[PDB]
Amino acid sequence: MIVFVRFNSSYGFPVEVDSDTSILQLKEVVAKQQGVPADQLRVIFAGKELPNHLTVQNCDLEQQSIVHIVQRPRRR
Numbered sequence: 001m002i003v004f005v006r007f008n009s010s011y012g013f014p015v016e017v018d019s020d021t022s023i024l025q026l027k028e029v030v031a032k033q034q035g036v037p038a039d040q041l042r043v044i045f046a047g048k049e050l051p052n053h054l055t056v057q058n059c060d061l062e063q064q065s066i067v068h069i070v071q072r073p074r075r076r
Contacts, residue, residue, distance in 0.1 A: 001056065004066040005030060012066045019057035023050045030069050044068040 004012030007030045015029055023043045031038040043050045045067045050059055061067070 001061075001063045001065075003056075003061055004064070005069055006066060007034060007069040008071075012068075017056055017061075019055065021056050022052065023054050023059075024052035026067070027052070027069065036071060040071055040073070042070050042072055044070060 001017050002014045003017050003026070005015050005026065006012035015026070017026065024038065026043060027038045027041040030036070030041055045059070045061060045065065048060070050061075050067075
């Protein structure tokens with residue numbers, strides 16, 4: 001699958017994932033891109049904040065889903 005990952009942007013970049021990809025691994029893509037620690041990131045999908053240990057097969061993510069990755073803490 002491709003999942004789109006939107007961080008501090010109007011658009012999400014395409015990420016090749018599979019059924020075994022965890023939310024944590026997904027955060028680490030952004031962590032490494034943006035130089036933010038993964039424990040300061042959160043994944044929001046279709047009004048659910050998804051925890052680190054969930055995998056793609058164990059949540060509602062599917063082909064071409066878009067997730068919004070946000071920073072916590074961050075100055076509002």
